[PDB]
């Protein structure tokens, strides 16, 4: 049984996800507009910034 934590109402489903460095919620990297080639050391979601 999978989890939904990202703001697009869609579950993990094997998709890479990054943690909100502040609120802790897990955001799909695609939704966070993050390329696998450049990944922030600290990430902040829309709610927390
Ligand atoms: Zn997502």
């Amino acid at each position: 049984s999978d989890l939904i934590t990202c703001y697009c109402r869609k579950p993990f489903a094997g998709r890479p996800m990054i943690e909100c460095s502040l609120c802790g919620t897990w955001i799909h990297l695609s939704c966070a507009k993050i390329k696998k080639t450049n990944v922030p050391d600290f990430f902040y979601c829309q709610k927390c910034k």
Side-chain angles (χ1 to χ4, degrees), residues 6 8 10 15 27-28 30-31:
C6 181
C8 73
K10 287 180 180 288
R15 298 168 65 193
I27 301 299
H28 284 86
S30 67
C31 283

Side-chain angles (χ1 to χ4, degrees), residues 30-45:
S30 67
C31 283
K33 278 240 249 285
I34 297 177
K35 300 291 184 182
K36 292 182 180 180
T37 63
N38 188 1
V39 174
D41 292 335
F42 287 97
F43 166 78
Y44 294 99
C45 75

